C-alpha cells in the first residue's frame, strides 16, 4: 500500500509524494551499511520497537521546474532575483557626473543636469538608485531632505515642512507627508542603501497594502554576509567604504544638527547638510559597485540573494484599536505605577532615613505631592526596599559582578565570588541571557520572567510589586520605540476595494501601518535582526502591553496566518548524520528518535530530553539546539544551572558529563556522532560551504585566516546557515506559491523558525496549505542535497498552523492583561482563532490552492 518502510522499519513518505519528488529508481543501500546501522541501533538498545503508523498524506505538489530539486530551487531564485541583479549591474557599471555646484531651494523633487542646472521633476524615473533621507528630531518623525543618484543624473528632494514655516503641524502622519519614491506602471525597481530600512520607512508608497513590486538592497546585509563580525569591519558605512573601496575617510559633521538642533538651523545650513548627504550617497554607490561581484562569486546559489531581497518587505498593520491601545496601555501604565508608589510607602513605613529622603520631592517644587511620589520601578532602590530572596537566598549587588544572591551557611552555584566578603554567606550571580561572563545592570528585565513562575524569585504588598514589575517589564523596555513607531494612515481612496466591501468595514475607523526596520542579513550566519519585533512575546496573561503582537490587528477583510516549523534544526542535523553514515533514514538513531517522536502521544525528543534532565519542554528545545550547534560540557552545565539552581556545580559537572557520555561519543559510539562527523568534514573542507546551497562563510572566519581556532563558531555556522538556507527556501517557495496560484496575501514578518503572513479573510487555509507544502519541499530538497533518496512521513509537515486576527502563539489565549483585563473580545471585539493540522488543512482546502 501507500505505506512504505526502510530496511530499518521506519515509515517513509507516501508513494505518490516520493514518486513526484525523488522520482523513480535509485541506489539501494549496501548490506554492510545496513548491518552497521542495525548494530548501532542494537548498541543503544532501541531496535525492533514497533511504531503505530501515522496516517498517510497524499497531495499533488505544484510543478517543480527543471529536472532536479537543486535545479528547481536554482531556477526559482534566478527567476526571482534576475531583474534586481540586472539593476545592480546597471548601477555597478556606470559613470557618475560631478556634484552640482548649488543645490535648489524649492518644494518637491528636482533634477540636476550635467552643467548644474536644476529642473523640477515629480519623481525620479530610474530603475536603480541610491537613497538618503534627513530627519530633524525636534520636529517629529517626518523626513526633511533627500538626495538621489543614478547612472544618468542626480536628484534632490526638499520637504514642505522645511520650505514653508507654520506655527503648528498635524500630529498624525499621512501619505501626504512622505517621500514619493514610486512609479506606477522595464518593470520593478531596485533601491540600494546602507541600512535601507530607514529610507524605506520614509517612502510615501511603502505603506500600501495592494503590493510593492519593489525590493530594497542593503549594503549592511551584503557586508554581514561577506565580511561580517560577531578583510572584515563593523557595519558602519564609513568603515565599509574604507574596507571595500578606500580613499579619504567620510566626514562626520560634529555639529549633528538633525539629532540636536531646530528647524531654523537646518533652514540656515541647507548646503552643508545637502553636501554631506550627497557625499554619503556617492560613497554608498562606490561601496555597492565594489561589493556586488564578491557577493555573486562567494554565494553562487541564487537562493541567498532571492531570500535576502524578499526578507526586506516587513509590514505591520495597526487599526484604530492601536490608538486606544497606546492610551489604555499608558493609562494602565500610569495607574499601576501610581498604585505601586503607594505600596512602597507602606513598606517603607513598616521598615528620616537617607534612602527615604531621596524618594521625596522638594518642598519648593511646584509638582510637590505628599510623600514618596518620585518612586518608579526603573529605579535601583526598589528591590532593596523589599528584601527579595532568590529561592530562599537573599539578593546582593556587586560592582564587579552586577546582581547576585547570598546563600547562608558559610553551596555550589553560579560562583561563589570571593570579591564580596559577606560574613557567613557565599556570593553568587544572577543568570544572564549572554552567559556568566556578562553582568546584569538591572533585575527588571525579560530574562527573569521564567525565574518567577517557578518560585525562584520571590518577594517579601511584597509579591504585588514584583508581579507588577513582571506586568510592566515588556512595556518598560520598548514603549519609547513602540510609541514612536511611525504610523501612516491611508485615506478611503487608497484602501483596497475588498476592505470597503467587507461587512466589518468601519467608515469612522482608522487604518494604519508600521514598517519594521529589518536588516535582511544582520548576522554572520545571515540572520535578520530587528531590536523589537523579532524578539517579543506573543501574548501573556500577566504582562502589561504584552498585547503588542496582539495589537498587530488586520483591518476588516484581512487576517494573520502563520505557522511554526517542527524540529527544523533537529531534523537538519538528523538528515546530515543519516546521509553521512549509511545513506538511509534512521541509521544514526538520532534521526530514528526524531522520526518516532510524537507530540500528541507525549514521547518525543524534546519530551524525553526534558524528562531525563528534569526541565521544561522549552528548556529541552534550547538544550537540544545548543548541543546541535556544538557545545562543551561547561556550556551544558551552565544551561542546566540556569534552568535549575538547587543543582550544585560539582554535581552540574557530573550531570553534564553523564549527558555527554550517551551523546557525542568518541566521533564514534555516540547517539549523535555521525552528524558531528559530517559537520566536521564539511566545515573543514577547502572554502567551507553550506551542505545544501554551497554558500561560503564570511571572510572573517575562513580556515585560511583563522587556522585551528574558533572551531565552535565554525561548526555552529554550518547548522545556523543551513537553517537560514531553510528560511530563504521557505521565503522563495512561499512567494512562488503565492504568485503561481494568485493568492492574495503579503509577507508580514518572520521570527527565526516562525513565519507569519497578513492574508485576506477569504483565503487563510490556502496560506496554511502553501506553508505546509513549503515545509515539505524544503525538507525534501534538504534531504536530497545530502544524498538521501527518501523522506520520513513523521517530519514531513507542520504540527499546527495558526489563523488569527492578532499575532499570538496560540489561537485560544484571551490575552487578559493588566491593561486588557477583559480580553480581546471584550475590549476590541476580537474573537479566538483556529489552529489546524495537515489533515484538517487538506480537508478544508480539498488539496487545492485554486478558487
Curated annotation (Swiss-Prot):
Keyword check for Protease = no
Reported effect of changing residue 722 to C?
Answer: In PEOB1; sporadic case
Which residues of this UniProt protein bind DNA?
376, 480, 523, 712-713
Q: What does the annotation give as the result of altering residue 629 to C?
A: In PEOA1, PEOB1 and SANDO; 45-fold decrease in apparent binding affinity for the incoming nucleoside triphosphate; 2-fold less accurate for basepair substitutions than wild-type
Give the GO biological process terms. base-excision repair; base-excision repair, gap-filling; DNA metabolic process; DNA replication proofreading; DNA-templated DNA replication; mitochondrial DNA replication
A Pfam family that this protein carries is DNApol_Exo
Q: What is the effect of changing residue 522 to S?
A: In PEOB1, MTDPS4A, MTDPS4B and LS; also found in a patient with epileptic encephalopathy, developmental delay and moderate intellectual disability
Instruction: State the PROSITE patterns in the record.
Output: DNA_POLYMERASE_A
Q: Where is this motif: Pol A?
A: 561-570
**Effect of mutating residue 505 to C:** In PEOA1 and MTDPS4A; uncertain significance
Identify the residues that bind a 2'-deoxyribonucleoside 5'-triphosphate.
564-565, 567, 569, 617, 621, 625, 753
Q: Where does RNA bind?
A: 362, 432, 441, 446, 537, 543
What does the record give as cofactor?
Mg(2+)
Where in this protein would one find the motif Exo III, according to its record?
276-284
Instruction: Provide the binding site for Mg(2+) 1.
Output: 564, 753
* Domain remarks: The polymerase domain encompasses three conserved active site motifs: Pol A (residues 887-896), Pol B (residues 943-958) and Pol C (residues 1134-1141). Binds the incoming dNTPs and undergoes an open to close coformation change to catalyze the formation of phosphodiester bond.
Summarize subunit and interaction data from the UniProt record for this chain.
Answer: Heterotrimer composed of a catalytic subunit and a homodimer of accessory subunits (POLG:POLG2). Interacts with TTC3. Interacts with LIG3.
Function summary = Catalytic subunit of DNA polymerase gamma solely responsible for replication of mitochondrial DNA (mtDNA). Replicates both heavy and light strands of the circular mtDNA genome using a single-stranded DNA template, RNA primers and the four deoxyribonucleoside triphosphates as substrates. Has 5' -> 3' polymerase activity.
Similarity remark: Belongs to the DNA polymerase type-A family.
Task: Name the disease.
Answer: Progressive external ophthalmoplegia with mitochondrial DNA deletions, autosomal dominant, 1: A disorder characterized by progressive weakness of ocular muscles and levator muscle of the upper eyelid. In a minority of cases, it is associated with skeletal myopathy, which predominantly involves axial or proximal muscles and which causes abnormal fatigability and even permanent muscle weakness. Ragged-red fibers and atrophy are found on muscle biopsy. A large proportion of chronic ophthalmoplegias are associated with other symptoms, leading to a multisystemic pattern of this disease. Progressive external ophthalmoplegia with mitochondrial DNA deletions, autosomal recessive, 1: A severe form of progressive external ophthalmoplegia, a disorder characterized by progressive weakness of ocular muscles and levator muscle of the upper eyelid. It is clinically more heterogeneous than the autosomal dominant forms.
Name of the protein described by the UniProt record: DNA polymerase subunit gamma-1
* The species this protein was found in: Homo sapiens (Human)
Q: What is the lineage of its organism?
A: Eukaryota, Metazoa, Chordata, Craniata, Vertebrata
Amino acid at each position: 500500500g501507500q505505506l512504505r518502510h526502510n530496511p530499518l522499519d521506519i515509515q517513509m513518505l507516501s508513494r505518490g509524494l516520493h514518486e513526484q519528488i525523488f522520482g523513480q529508481g535509485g541506489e539501494m543501500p549496501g548490506e554492510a551499511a545496513v548491518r552497521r546501522s542495525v548494530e548501532h541501533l542494537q548498541k543503544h538498545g532501541l531496535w525492533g520497537q514497533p511504531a503505530v503508523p501515522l496516517p498517510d498524506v497524499e497531495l499533488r505538489l505544484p510543478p517543480l521546474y527543471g529536472d532536479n530539486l537543486d535545479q528547481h530551487f536554482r531556477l526559482l531564485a534566478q527567476k526571482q532575483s534576475l531583474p534586481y541583479l540586472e539593476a545592480a549591474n546597471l548601477l555597478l557599471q556606470a559613470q557618475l557626473p560631478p556634484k552640482p555646484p548649488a543645490w535648489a531651494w524649492a518644494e518637491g523633487w528636482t533634477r540636476y543636469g550635467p552643467e548644474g542646472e536644476a529642473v523640477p521633476v515629480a519623481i525620479p524615473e530610474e530603475r536603480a538608485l541610491v537613497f538618503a533621507v534627513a530627519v530633524c528630531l525636534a520636529e517629529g518623525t517626518c523626513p526633511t531632505l533627500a538626495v538621489a543618484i543614478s547612472p544618468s543624473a542626480w536628484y534632490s528632494w526638499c520637504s514642505q515642512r522645511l520650505v514653508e514655516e507654520r506655527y503648528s503641524w498635524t500630529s498624525q502622519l499621512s501619505p501626504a507627508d512622505l517621500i514619493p519614491l514610486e512609479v506606477p506602471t522595464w518593470q520593478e525597481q531596485l533601491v540600494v542603501g546602507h541600512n535601507v530600512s530607514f529610507d524605506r520607512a520614509h517612502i510615501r508608497e511603502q505603506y500600501l497594502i495592494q503590493g510593492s513590486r519593489m525590493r530594497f538592497l542593503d549594503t549592511m546585509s551584503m557586508h554581514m554576509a561577506i565580511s561580517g563580525l560577531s578583510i572584515s569591519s563593523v557595519n558602519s558605512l564609513a568603515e565599509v567604504h574604507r574596507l571595500y573601496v578606500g580613499g579619504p575617510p567620510l566626514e562626520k559633521e560634529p555639529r549633528e544638527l538633525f539629532v540636536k538642533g531646530t528647524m531654523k538651523d537646518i533652514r540656515e545650513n541647507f548646503q552643508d547638510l545637502m553636501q554631506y548627504c550627497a557625499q554619503d550617497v556617492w560613497a554608498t554607490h562606490e561601496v555597492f559597485q565594489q561589493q556586488l561581484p564578491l557577493f555573486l562569486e562567494r554565494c553562487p546559489h541564487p537562493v541567498t540573494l532571492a531570500g535576502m531581497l524578499e526578507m526586506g518587505v516587513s509590514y505591520l498593520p495597526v487599526n484604530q484599536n492601536w490608538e486606544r491601545y497606546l492610551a489604555e496601555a499608558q493609562g494602565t501604565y500610569e495607574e499601576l505605577q501610581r498604585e505601586m508608589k503607594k505600596s512602597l510607602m507602606d513598606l517603607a513605613n513598616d521598615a528620616h532615613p537617607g534612602w527615604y529622603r531621596k524618594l521625596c520631592p522638594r518642598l519648593d517644587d511646584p509638582a510637590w505631592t505628599p510623600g514618596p511620589s518620585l518612586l518608579s520601578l526603573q529605579m535601583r532602590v526598589t528591590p532593596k526596599l523589599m528584601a527579595l530572596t532568590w529561592d530562599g537566598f537573599p539578593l546582593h549587588y556587586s560592582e564587579r559582578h552586577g546582581w547576585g544572591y547570598l546563600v547562608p551557611g558559610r553551596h555550589h552555584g553560579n560562583g561563589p565570588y570571593n570579591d564580596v566578603d559577606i560574613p557567613g554567606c557565599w556570593f553568587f550571580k544572577l543568570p544572564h541571557k549572554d552567559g556568566n561572563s556578562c553582568n546584569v545592570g538591572s533585575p527588571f528585565a525579560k530574562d527573569f520572567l521564567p525565574k518567577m513562575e517557578d518560585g525562584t524569585l520571590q518577594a517579601g504588598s511584597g509579591p504585588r510589586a514584583l508581579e507588577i514589575n513582571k506586568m510592566i517589564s515588556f512595556w518598560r523596555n520598548a514603549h519609547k520605540r513602540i510609541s514612536s513607531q511611525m504610523v501612516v494612515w491611508l485615506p478611503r481612496s487608497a484602501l483596497p476595494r475588498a476592505v470597503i466591501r467587507h461587512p466589518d468595514y468601519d467608515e469612522e475607523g482608522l487604518y494604519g501601518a508600521i514598517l519594521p526596520q529589518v536588516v535582511t542579513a544582520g548576522t554572520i550566519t545571515r540572520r535578520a535582526v530587528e531590536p523589537t519585533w523579532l524578539t517579543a512575546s506573543n501574548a501573556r496573561p500577566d504582562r502589561v502591553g504584552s498585547e503588542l503582537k496582539a495589537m498587530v490587528q488586520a483591518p476588516p477583510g484581512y487576517t494573520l496566518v502563520g505557522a511554526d516549523v517542527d524540529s527544523q534544526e533537529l531534523w537538519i542535523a538528523a538528515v546530515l548524520g543519516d546521509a553521512h553514515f549509511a545513506g538511509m533514514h534512521g541509521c544514526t538513531a538520532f534521526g530514528w528518535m526524531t522520526l518516532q517522536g510524537r507530540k500528541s502521544r507525549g514521547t518525543d525528543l524534546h519530551s524525553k530530553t526534558a524528562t531525563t534532565v528534569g526541565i521544561s519542554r522549552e528548556h529541552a528545545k534550547i538544550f537540544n539546539y545548543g548541543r546541535i550547534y556544538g557545545a562543551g560540557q561547561p556550556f551544558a552545565e551552565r544551561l542546566l544551572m540556569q534552568f535549575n539552581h538547587r543543582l550544585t556545580q560539582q554535581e552540574a559537572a557530573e550531570k553534564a558529563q553523564q549527558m555527554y557520555a550517551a551523546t557525542k561519543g568518541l566521533w564514534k559510539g555516540g547517539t549523535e556522532s555521525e552528524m558531528f562527523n559530517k559537520l566536521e568534514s564539511i566545515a573543514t573542507s577547502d572554502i567551507p560551504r553550506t551542505p545544501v546551497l554551497g554558500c561560503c562563510i564570511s571572510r572573517a572566519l575562513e580556515p585560511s585566516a583563522v587556522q585551528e581556532e574558533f572551531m565552535t563558531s565554525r561548526v555552529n555556522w554550518v547548522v545556523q546557515s543551513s537553517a537560514v538556507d531553510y528560511l530563504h527556501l521557505m521565503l522563495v517557495a512561499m512567494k512562488w506559491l503565492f504568485e503561481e496560484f494568485a493568492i492574495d496575501g503579503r509577507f508580514c514578518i518572520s521570527i527565526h523558525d516562525e513565519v507569519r503572513y497578513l492574508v485576506r479573510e477569504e483565503d487563510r487555509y490556502r496560506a496554511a496549505l502553501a506553508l505546509q507544502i513549503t515545509n515539505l519541499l524544503t525538507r525534501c530538497m534538504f534531504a536530497y542535497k545530502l544524498g538521501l533518496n527518501d523522506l520520513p512521513q513523521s517530519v514531513a509537515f507542520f504540527s499546527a498552523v495558526d489563523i488569527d486576527r492578532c499575532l499570538r502563539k496560540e489561537v485560544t489565549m484571551d490575552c487578559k492583561t493588566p491593561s486588557n483585563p477583559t480580553g480581546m473580545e471584550r475590549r476590541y471585539g476580537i474573537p479566538q482563532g483556529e489552529a489546524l493540522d495537515i489533515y484538517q488543512i487538506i480537508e478544508l482546502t480539498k488539496g487545492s490552492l485554486e478558487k
